[PDB]
UniProtKB/Swiss-Prot annotation, chain A:
The lineage of its organism: Eukaryota, Metazoa, Chordata, Craniata, Vertebrata. Pfam families: RNase_PH, RNase_PH_C. It is found in: Cytoplasm; Nucleus, Nucleolus; Nucleus; Nucleus, Nucleoplasm. GO terms for biological process: defense response to virus; DNA deamination; histone mRNA catabolic process; maturation of 5.8S rRNA; nuclear mRNA surveillance; nuclear-transcribed mRNA catabolic process; poly(A)-dependent snoRNA 3'-end processing; positive regulation of cell growth. Gene3D superfamilies: GHMP Kinase, N-terminal domain. One of its GO terms (molecular function) is RNA binding. This is Exosome complex component RRP41. The keyword RNA-binding applies.
Swiss-Prot record, chain D:
The chain holds residues 1 to 353 of 439 of the full protein. It comes from the Eukaryota. Belongs to the RNase PH family. One of its GO terms (molecular function) is 3'-5'-RNA exonuclease activity. One of its GO terms (biological process) is RNA processing. It is found in: Cytoplasm; Nucleus; Nucleus, Nucleolus; Nucleus, Nucleoplasm. This is Exosome complex component RRP45. Residues 335-353 are annotated as: Disordered. Non-catalytic component of the RNA exosome complex which has 3'->5' exoribonuclease activity and participates in a multitude of cellular RNA processing and degradation events. In the nucleus, the RNA exosome complex is involved in proper maturation of stable RNA species such as rRNA, snRNA and snoRNA, in the elimination of RNA processing by-products and non-coding 'pervasive' transcripts, such as antisense RNA species and promoter-upstream transcripts (PROMPTs), and of mRNAs with processing defects, thereby limiting or excluding their export to the cytoplasm.
Swiss-Prot record, chain G:
Belongs to the RNR ribonuclease family. It is found in: Cytoplasm. One of its GO terms (biological process) is mRNA catabolic process. Changing D62N: No change of exonuclease activity. The gene is DIS3L. It comes from the Eukaryota. Residues 334-390 form the CSD2 domain. Keywords: Cytoplasm, Exonuclease, Exosome, Hydrolase, Magnesium, Nuclease, Phosphoprotein, RNA-binding. GO terms for molecular function: 3'-5'-RNA exonuclease activity; enzyme binding; exoribonuclease II activity; RNA binding. This is DIS3-like exonuclease 1. Component of the RNA exosome complex. The catalytically inactive RNA exosome core (Exo-9) complex is believed to associate with catalytic subunits EXOSC10, and DIS3 or DIS3L in cytoplasmic- and nuclear-specific RNA exosome complex forms. Residues 236-295 form the CSD1 domain. Its main location: cytoplasm.
UniProtKB/Swiss-Prot annotation, chain H:
It is found in: Cytoplasm; Nucleus, Nucleolus; Nucleus. The chain holds residues 137 to 275 of 275 of the full protein. This is Exosome complex component RRP40. Keywords: Acetylation, Cytoplasm, Disease variant, Exosome, Isopeptide bond, Neurodegeneration, Nucleus, RNA-binding, rRNA processing, Ubl conjugation. It comes from the Eukaryota. The keyword S-adenosyl-L-methionine does not apply. One of its GO terms (cellular component) is nucleolus. Belongs to the RRP40 family. GO terms for biological process: CUT catabolic process; DNA deamination; exonucleolytic trimming to generate mature 3'-end of 5.8S rRNA from tricistronic rRNA transcript (SSU-rRNA, 5.8S rRNA, LSU-rRNA); isotype switching; mRNA catabolic process; nuclear polyadenylation-dependent rRNA catabolic process; nuclear-transcribed mRNA catabolic process; poly(A)-dependent snoRNA 3'-end processing. GO terms for molecular function: 3'-5'-RNA exonuclease activity; RNA binding. There is a cross-link at K15 (Glycyl lysine isopeptide (Lys-Gly) (interchain with G-Cter in SUMO2)). The gene is EXOSC3. It comes from Homo sapiens (Human).
Length: 241, 251, 35, 353, 289, 286, 390, 139
């Protein structure tokens, strides 16, 4: 099956270094302390966070120096072509939520809430392509909605490598083809990487180019989400006064 | 499969699905009769309170443990419903079942309206019921027995709980029946079970689902359920009298 | 070309090293010089 | 129970050392702790010791029916496990956030690299095919669990030898090491993990850190890269914030180190095969150091089995025979009978009525 | 009774219905704020390398050396001499625990409590037994913050006559940034009820205490003419708090007067709220302006 | 939880036909049902009764008939309770509530005439259609039963069930052949799908659509399942207090009337939403 | 910039499971048109192979004229061809990999006038399906609209000639835009290119062989080999004395025809050979003397079932590079060439074909299937290297 | 079980001039109650009350762990281990009967060498072995 024609167009019609269309929203729920909603291409995510509160259970499990970030992950049973229902014991949700806890224990400036918990929940309503970057961006937006301070605006994007070229924002069709996928979590101001992932084989000479293309696609996501945040803050400033 | 049990065959189809004897015909009866019931209290010796209830083809054993450590200002009432695997047409998975949890909750939302937990702060009561055989109305036995066990174990309650059961005939002129059996329950269209306090005259629990959609049949099903709960009371009246006469005379 | 600068850079340590000596000390302390 | 806490003197001591670029046990930055392999007697069993860590690897295969779809391959389980003896803290159900990342590291490396040939592990299609199942155990925790676990899995998989079968027409047959000789496996490449630790916000790095150096570190970078020049996985984790020249430096380091490690592994497997083929003695027994106080050897010994007949005979003869009060069974009504002191009446009746 | 079933309507963004341009300075996390020779960081910002970097979305407010960013969604932060309202969630041996929408729990010490009697009779260990009897689980108090602990905790005291356990009424919870700072947070609105505008986001509405500490129960029926007023204020408070309006006495009085013409049951519609908020906006515009 | 004085004020108000919102003893707050929100599924709904939030999905798949009857399909319910709704629902903890709702829904739908079962069988003893109803709790704001029994009738009204004309003949292509048309489906005749009506009892008066605060002041309640035609399917009593025989008879009339009005108004609103088709766009979560 | 749209699909898997997979589509403003009269160079910049205007016209098959008649459109006298990607996609998803590989070689060549056009990635040539449709009608509609757009972008300067083998496109589409015709192919040739009579004769050849085509393809139905049957039939048919059974061999000069049935019965044909291999024990009836053939009329047979079932285990090879790079790079199915002329080719599924093109391998056989003309297989083990004695 | 100090157990400590003790610091001190009836309790100045080197120790050294046998061997009146080991590298040690040792050499290299070579002195009996080992490590 052709994943890259001779003219250079992909299956869905975009070039190598081209992103999908994103369409976000801020302030979706009322009961919670924060909310967000993002649709990166054809993947629909959702995130809900709860502000610093008293530690549940009170089982002397606190940290006297910082706060306790607790992130979960779930997925609807109609998120793909087949039903594929899973119990709440799978190790895919735990490992992705553990990478989420790892990146948000590094992005959030957590040494300001001693003896406090931060509960982060992510719900995926339709998964087609990169789920990790959509969850990271949806929870960054939900945390911003909650007013929690952070060092920067963390954003994630993936990439690939087919026939000597580097792709960007791979889809499920391209992902399920046995290629060197790779994902980051970037802080735009400093260029630092909070998490790095890859799978399948790839020669060492093209790692620099796949990583650079992924970082550039993350910097391209940064501007598009930045305009959404600026429009939201200008909206609320207009509302206030 | 399970690392805490003895592993056998991975799959096992019971011979009922291969049973070449076609399903028989139940028959007919008078819907104004009750199966004779025998009740005994204080059966187990190592339990704080226990009771054993048997009527026709139904065999249920209930035991009550005393208050233990751990709406406070009030005590909890833990419940646990479990039926023997050797009951009914087929075998059942030992680990559990959604039917067992639904009936456990239908028990919990029916024995708490009787006892007064405002006398056991920070304590809790645990009730365990076991069905040795399913030969008729079951929820009409897991309520009477778990209330008799509570009354013989010396916990303070406002009144007892007496249960009954009903089922709907599948004919062109359906009529509700009292104390149905498996031959009259698997061929039925609907069923109803009531939990009535006989003295306080207050319904404790209600449950019913089926094909009867006119709000004039359920009035009779409810009120004949109330007549059943007022007719089963005297046997439970003499059962606790005999139980207390023997317990006191045992000193 | 690129292979030999970093070859001489990231080799296992050559010969008489401290780790060598301290492991010698460990297995001579646990030795048995009476059989 | 928990682990001894970390003082504020050890942190200071490790960090003045690391700034000065000298470590406790003498090895410089770009060094490994030397390795020591030991082979069992039945195939697919080895003991690797990296420094003072131990891992036990053991492969074993078995014949099942191949699911639905993928009718012409075989399956490959894995199950890492952490033994309570590795360290005080490990507890059967209280360390559930290391097991996951470890099993994952191992599975992504071994199964996505496509070095084992699971194509040619079929007998029929739609019917019985071999299902291998690797198993590793951690015995002693001294830091760098994953390098040792990976080397262990590699050696255990490159030392297994299957059973073997005859298939012709539509008929099966299963041999045994006396009927037919066990057969090796087919291994394309050898993916071997490497780890790096970062100290005081990426300013220094140290190759192959142990458990104390592990408690004074920010985050970890692992880079799994098979032989030749082909990288197979990387997984940054911990608390680190990385640059881009550094990933390349790390890749160079892992290349060099995996070259050397593959040298060692190949040499050890060859020597082991030579020993097994010469005809000498092998196994876990003939590995115990003899120049050491805690080893002792004893050939066989008949102890004296000359007396047991007499003792048993006199014991049986010298004790009281079974007695002869025989009891009677009572019959109430077919179905129930009682034996013992019995009950007075025939049965209770109208006791309280 | 018809059980009206309307359909959702797309929201109109940019607030074009009135039209305003902001003259403020707005920032987002990662933006580099002014980096002159010497400045002091406020709450909402942090420092990197010779840089003042904003860490939360909001608007900068400076008073003469101080760059800080004021976020529009936070949790309550305690300050000395601040009126708060809370609920008891735990009764301990020598304290209670009260939830007041803060990052932690708030402690009400037994040493600071108006015990029944309201005078100098005694204080000893005999009271410790019955302290957990009257202040039971899930009760409402209205106290004043005493001091700030070393980990963001707040200690609150009840050493007055206006503070103590509250009685009948309704509670409405909003965000703790819509209550306007004043010098009198206690009000006696000339409608038939009163209100306490807790700085932590707890709004309590209760009828006027007829003539003239929790000693009185007064568990007797409340007249019909008082419930309709409490329901009117409850709905008006929800209406004013929702879109933007900052809450205080005149806005609530203005909307209450504006709400007489039509019934209390029918005001839940998106447009009736709009036709009341705009009317209150223009009445405030023609009064203040 | 709420104090004793608040409970006394609320019960007195209920006895006076006044409530904190301002409605009466029988008024019902509006809802915002919608359809066709999810793409990958074959039917959707989104019910908003207040602070609560529901989202469901129906997917029709190929399957095998059960043993007792070959000319039928079956229904499988699974009421998930997402942990984003409330922090105490983190991981384990939403299992008991989900099982309670799923078993109640099964009892509601466990009848021969619920919608149909002939339509979902194509070849006796060899094939049948299966329906996957997937409820997803997003927020909890009280009265969850009616807010789910409405989103189920709504999603069931929006099913597709793409028609398959494959011949079962052995000589012919027995393997299931579809119609190859991406927009060729069939309706489901859901006119008489029942719904649940909850009637909380406070004091000696019963209240429809009680809020969480008004639910905490009540001691018992009864659930009735009524179709558009006005027939009863299931009847389960839930609560922590006794009820008395009389109040059953005087709650049945209110359950019947509220059910009839609820069903007629839902038919009217669904026909209004359906009268205009691909126009009006679709807005949800954005 | 771009404009998202969707595409549903109905994929049928091997197990009989269909699914409504949904997928993406991204339109663009400016699809390059690779023409020398594009009235704005910069917007696309024409960075590829670019025609030179000398021709009288331009002919675009709609989908079929390149599906089957492709073998015509190679003559270096033919000039001015442009391919619409929708036809390429049709032929790829309908004609396997061989015809498509010739087509893509045709395109990737600086000898002809072939280019490719992004009909489906252009913002006003894309059209969505409607109530009541088919791939053919939707296809012709899309091709028509693409033609009209290309004409109007050309400013009505170069006369487009839409050729079809559809007749209804002729009667309707070709009458409502001045400067563009919908004519049949032979009419195209005659009307324009007489001295190409060689093509005229090859077209008449292929059109008479076309009239054949439907007759051979509709006289084949849905069965390829006689279906087998039980054994009790074969005991009886032996005993009653209507079935001989012996060994069976094949010639090797001629190995698809000259099959012998050692009692010699001449088996002619694969459809007569009925999925069976040498060294086998097959039961056979006789046949009427009016249908026997020559080497005189010999007693040919008919095999219905195989009692006893004797296989073996051969040595085969993998295809060549320039025909693997076209298989994809994750090419599940593959074809293998045996080493003796007596054996058919075998269908197996592997994922190492691009790094074993210098080795002999070994396979076996599990099941002969009738929806394939070949038998299925699976790899067994590696062998030595082609070139060294070992 | 963990032990238990008191704020006034240090030298000259009162309700006002409390001593500075953080979490995760090493203390030299002696026991006064160690029966199997309570958590052990230790005071940290003296019997009389003048802290003789006791209190919080360790600022630029290394604390490692050895077995009880080596501690018993070193704490002997006829032990020449410390004198000879200190002949090569000047040192100062504070032994602990729980299996802990605090060392402080001059150079970090010497501290590494003393830390490694002291754990092995329980074995490798003197004379035929010790002089050659000392000569080899001289370097």
């Amino acid at each position: 099956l052709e994943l890259l024609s001779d003219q250079g167009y992909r299956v869905d019609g975009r070039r190598a270094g081209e992103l999908r269309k994103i369409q976000a929203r801020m302030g979706v729920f009322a009961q919670a302390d924060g909310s967000a909603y993002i649709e990166q291409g054809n993947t629909k995510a959702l995130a809900v966070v709860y502000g610093p509160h008293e530690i549940r259970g009170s089982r002397a499990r606190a940290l006297p120096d910082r706060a306790l970030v607790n992130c979960q992950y779930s997925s609807a049973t109609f998120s793909t072509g087949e039903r594929k229902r899973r119990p709440h014991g799978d190790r895919k949700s735990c490992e992705m939520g553990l990478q989420l806890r790892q990146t948000f224990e590094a992005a959030i400036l957590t040494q300001l809430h001693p003896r406090s918990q931060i509960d982060i929940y992510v719900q995926v309503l339709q998964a087609d392509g990169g789920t990790y970057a959509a969850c990271v961006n949806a929870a960054t937006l939900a945390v911003l909605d909650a007013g929690i301070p952070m060092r920067d605006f963390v954003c994630a994007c993936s990439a690939g490598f087919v026939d000597g070229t580097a792709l960007a924002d791979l889809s499920h069709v391209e992902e399920a083809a046995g290629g060197p996928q790779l994902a980051l979590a970037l802080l735009p101001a400093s260029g630092q990487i909070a998490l790095l992932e890859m799978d399948a084989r790839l020669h060492e000479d093209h790692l620099e180019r796949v990583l650079e293309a992924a970082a550039q696609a993350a910097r391209d996501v940064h501007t598009l989400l930045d305009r959404v945040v600026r429009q939201h803050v200008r909206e609320a400033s207009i509302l206030l006064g | 499969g399970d690392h805490r049990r003895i592993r056998g065959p991975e799959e096992s189809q019971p011979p009922q699905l291969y049973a070449a004897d076609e399903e028989e015909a139940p028959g007919t009866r008078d819907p104004t009769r009750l199966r004779p019931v025998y009740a005994r209290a204080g059966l187990l010796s190592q339990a704080k309170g226990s009771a054993y209830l048997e009527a026709g083809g139904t065999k249920v054993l209930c035991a009550v443990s005393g208050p233990r450590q751990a709406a406070a200002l009030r005590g909890r009432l833990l419940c646990d419903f479990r039926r023997a695997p050797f009951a009914g047409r087929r075998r059942r998975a030992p680990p559990g079942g959604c039917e067992e949890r639904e009936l456990a909750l239908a028990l919990q939302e029916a024995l708490e309206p009787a006892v007064r937990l405002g006398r056991y702060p920070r304590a809790q009561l645990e009730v365990s019921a076991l069905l040795l055989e399913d030969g008729g109305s079951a929820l009409a036995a897991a309520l009477t027995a778990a209330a008799l066990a509570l009354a013989d174990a010396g916990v303070e309650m406002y009144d007892l709980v007496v249960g009954c059961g009903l089922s709907l005939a599948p004919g062109p002129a359906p009529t509700w029946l009292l104390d149905p059996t498996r031959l009259e329950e698997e061929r039925a269209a609907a069923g109803l079970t009531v939990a009535l306090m006989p003295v306080l005259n207050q319904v404790a629990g209600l449950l019913g689902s089926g094909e009867g959609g006119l709000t004039e049949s359920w009035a009779e099903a409810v009120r004949l359920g109330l007549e059943g709960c007022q007719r089963l009371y005297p046997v439970l009246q003499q059962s606790l009298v005999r139980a207390a006469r023997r317990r006191g005379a045992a000193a | 070309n690129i292979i030999q600068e970093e070859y001489q850079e990231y080799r296992q340590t050559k010969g008489r090293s401290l780790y060598t000596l301290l492991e010698e000390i460990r297995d001579l302390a646990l030795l048995d010089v009476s059989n | 129970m928990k682990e001894t806490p970390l003082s504020n003197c050890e942190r200071r001591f490790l960090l003045r050392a690391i700034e000065e670029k000298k470590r406790l046990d003498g090895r410089q930055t770009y060094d490994y702790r030397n390795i020591r392999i030991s082979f069992g007697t039945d195939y697919g069993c080895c003991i690797v010791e990296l420094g003072k860590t131990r891992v036990l690897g053991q492969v074993s295969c078995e014949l099942v029916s191949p699911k639905l779809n993928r009718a012409t391959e075989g399956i490959l389980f894995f199950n890492l496990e952490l033994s309570q003896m590795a360290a005080p803290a490990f507890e059967p159900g209280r360390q559930s956030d290391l097991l996951v990342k470890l099993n994952r590291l191992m599975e992504r490396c071994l199964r996505n690299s496509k070095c084992i040939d699971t194509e040619s592990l079929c007998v029929v299609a739609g019917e019985k095919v071999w299902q291998i199942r690797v198993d590793l155990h951690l015995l002693n925790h001294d830091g760098n669990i994953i390098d040792a676990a990976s080397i262990a899995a590699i050696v255990a998989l490159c030392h297994f030898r299957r059973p073997d079968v005859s298939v012709q027409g539509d008929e099966v047959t299963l041999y045994t090491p006396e009927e037919r000789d066990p057969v090796p496996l087919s291994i394309h490449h050898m993916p071997i993990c490497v780890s790096f630790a970062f100290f005081q916000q990426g300013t220094y790095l140290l190759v192959d850190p142990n458990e104390r150096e592990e408690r004074v570190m920010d985050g970890l970078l692992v880079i799994a890269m098979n032989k030749h020049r082909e990288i197979c996985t990387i997984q940054s984790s911990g608390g680190i914030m990385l640059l881009k020249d550094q990933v390349l430096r790390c890749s160079k380091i892992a290349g060099v180190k995996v070259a050397e490690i593959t040298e060692l592994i190949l040499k050890a497997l060859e020597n082991d095969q030579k020993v097994r083929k010469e005809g000498g003695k092998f196994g876990f027994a003939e590995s115990i150091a003899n120049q050491r106080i805690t080893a002792f050897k004893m050939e066989k010994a008949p102890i004296d089995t000359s007396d047991v007949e007499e003792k048993a005979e006199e014991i049986i003869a010298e004790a009281e025979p079974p007695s002869e009060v025989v009891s009677t069974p009572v019959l109430w009504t077919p179905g129930t009978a009682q034996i013992g002191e019995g009950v007075e009446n025939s049965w209770g009746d109208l006791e309280d009525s | 009774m018809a059980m009206e079933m309307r359909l959702p309507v797309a929201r109109k963004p940019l607030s074009e219905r009135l039209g305003r341009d902001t003259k403020k300075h707005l920032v987002v996390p990662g933006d580099t704020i002014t980096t002159d020779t010497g400045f002091m960081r406020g709450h909402g910002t942090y420092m990197g390398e010779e840089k003042l970097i904003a860490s939360v979305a909001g608007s900068v407010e400076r008073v003469n050396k101080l760059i800080c960013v004021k976020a529009l969604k936070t949790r309550y932060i305690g300050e000395v001499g601040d009126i708060v309202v809370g609920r008891i969630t735990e009764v301990q041996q020598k304290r209670w625990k009260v939830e007041t929408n803060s990052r932690l729990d708030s402690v009400l010490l037994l040493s600071s409590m108006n015990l029944p009697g309201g005078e100098l009779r005694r204080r000893s260990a005999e009271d410790e037994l019955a302290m957990r009897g009257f202040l039971q689980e899930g009760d409402l108090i209205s106290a004043e913050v005493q001091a700030v602990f070393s980990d963001g905790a707040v200690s609150l005291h009840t050493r007055s006559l206006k503070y103590g356990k509250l009685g009948q009424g309704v509670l409405v919870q909003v965000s703790p940034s819509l209550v306007k700072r004043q010098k009198t947070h206690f009000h006696d609105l000339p409608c038939g009820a009163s209100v306490i505008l807790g700085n932590n986001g707890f709004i309590w509405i209760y009828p006027t205490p007829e003539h003239k500490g929790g000693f009185i129960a007064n568990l007797e029926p409340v007249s019909l003419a008082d419930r309709e007023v409490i329901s009117r204020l409850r709905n008006c408070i929800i209406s004013l708090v929702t879109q933007r309006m900052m809450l205080y006495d005149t806005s609530i009085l203005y909307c209450y007067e504006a709400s007489l013409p039509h019934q209390i049951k029918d005001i839940l519609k998106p447009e009736i709220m709009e036709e009341i908020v705009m009317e209150t906006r223009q009445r405030l515009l023609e009064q203040e302006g | 939880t709420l104090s004793e004085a608040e409970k006394v004020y609320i019960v007195h108000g209920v006895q006076e036909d006044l409530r904190v919102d301002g409605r009466g003893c029988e008024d019902y707050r509006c809802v915002e049902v919608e359809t066709d929100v999810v793409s990958n599924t074959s039917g959707s709904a989104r019910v908003k009764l207040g602070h609560t939030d529901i989202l469901v999905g129906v997917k029709a798949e190929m399957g095998t008939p059960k043993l007792e009857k070959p000319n039928e399909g079956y229904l499988e319910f699974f009421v998930d309770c997402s942990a984003s709704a409330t922090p105490e629902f983190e991981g384990r903890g939403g299992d008991d509530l989900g099982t309670e709702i799923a078993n109640t829904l099964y009892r509601i739908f466990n009848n021969k005439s619920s919608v149909d079962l002939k339509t979902l069988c194509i070849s006796p003893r060899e094939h049948c259609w299966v329906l996957y109803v997937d409820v997803l709790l997003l927020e909890c704001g009280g009265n969850l039963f009616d807010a789910i029994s409405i989103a189920v009738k709504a999603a069931l009204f929006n099913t597709r069930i793409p028609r398959v004309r494959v011949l079962e003949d052995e000589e012919g292509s027995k393997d299931i052949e579809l119609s190859d048309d991406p927009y060729d489906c069939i309706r489901l005749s859901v006119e008489n799908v029942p719904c649940i009506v909850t009637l909380c009892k406070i004091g000696y008066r019963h209240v429809v659509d009680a809020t969480l605060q008004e639910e905490a002041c009540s001691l018992a309640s009864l659930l009735v399942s009524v179709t558009s035609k006005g027939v009863v399917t299931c009847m389960r009593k839930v609560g922590k207090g006794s009820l008395d025989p009389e109040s059953i008879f005087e709650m049945m009339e209110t359950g019947k009337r509220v059910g009839k009005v609820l069903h007629a108004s839902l038919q009217s609103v669904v026909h209004k939403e359906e009268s205009l088709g691909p126009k009006r766009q679709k807005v949800g979560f954005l | 910039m771009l404009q998202k749209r969707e595409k549903v699909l109905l994929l049928r898997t091997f197990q009989g499971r269909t699914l409504r997979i949904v997928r993406e589509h991204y339109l663009r403003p400016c699809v390059p048109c690779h023409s020398p009269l594009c009235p704005q160079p910069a917007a696309c910049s024409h960075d590829g192979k670019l025609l030179s205007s000398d021709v009288t016209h331009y002919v675009i098959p709609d989908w079929k004229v390149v599906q089957d008649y492709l073998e015509i459109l190679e003559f270096p006298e033919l000039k001015g061809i442009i391919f619409m990607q929708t036809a390429c996609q049709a032929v790829q998803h309908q004609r396997g990999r061989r015809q498509y590989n010739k087509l893509r070689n045709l395109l990737k060549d600086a000898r002809h006038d072939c280019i490719l056009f992004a009909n489906e990635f252009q913002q006003c040539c894309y059209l969505p399906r409607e109530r009541g449709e088919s791939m053919e009608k939707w296809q012709t509609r899309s091709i028509y609209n693409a033609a009209v757009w290309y004409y109007h972008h050309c400013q009505d300067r170069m006369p487009i000639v839409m050729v079809t083998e559809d007749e209804e496109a002729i009667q309707q589409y070709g009458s409502e835009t001045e400067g563009v015709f919908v004519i049949t192919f032979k009419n195209y040739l005659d009307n324009f290119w007489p001295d190409l009579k060689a093509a005229h004769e090859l077209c008449d050849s292929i059109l008479q062989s076309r009239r054949e085509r439907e007759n051979e393809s509709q006289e084949s139905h849905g069965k390829e080999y006689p279906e087998h049957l039980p054994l009790e039939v074969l005991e009886a048919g032996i005993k009653s004395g209507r079935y001989i059974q012996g060994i069976l061999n094949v010639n090797k000069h001629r190995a698809q025809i000259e099959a012998f049935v050692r009692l010699d019965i001449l088996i002619h044909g694969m459809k007569a050979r009925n999925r069976s291999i040498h060294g086998d024990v097959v039961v056979v009836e006789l046949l009427p003397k009016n249908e026997w053939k020559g080497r005189e009329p010999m007693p040919t047979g008919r095999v219905v079932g195989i009692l006893q079932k004797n296989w073996r285990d051969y040595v085969v090879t993998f295809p060549s590079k320039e025909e693997v790079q076209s298989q994809g790079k994750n090419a599940q199915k593959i074809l293998v060439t045996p080493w003796d002329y007596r054996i058919p080719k075998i269908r197996i599924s592997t994922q190492q074909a691009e790094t074993l093109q210098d080795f002999r391998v070994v396979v076996r056989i599990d099941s002969w299937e009738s929806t394939s003309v070949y038998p299925n297989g699976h790899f067994v083990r590696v062998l030595g290297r082609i070139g060294d004695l070992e | 079980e963990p032990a238990s100090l008191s704020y006034l157990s240090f030298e000259g400590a009162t309700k006002r001039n409390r001593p500075n003790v953080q979490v995760g610091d090493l203390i030299y001190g002696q026991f006064v109650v160690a029966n199997k009836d309570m958590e052990p309790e230790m005071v940290c100045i003296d019997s009389c009350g003048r802290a003789n080197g006791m209190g919080v120790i360790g600022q630029d050294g290394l604390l490692f762990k050895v077995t009880l046998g080596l501690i018993r061997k070193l704490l002997a009146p006829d032990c020449e281990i410390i004198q000879e080991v200190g002949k090569l590298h000047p040192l100062e040690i504070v032994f602990g009967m729980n299996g802990r040792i605090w060392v402080k050499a001059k150079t970090i290299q010497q501290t590494l060498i003393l830390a490694n070579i002291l754990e092995a002195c329980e074995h490798m009996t003197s004379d035929q072995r010790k002089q050659i080992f000392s000569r080899l490590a001289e370097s």
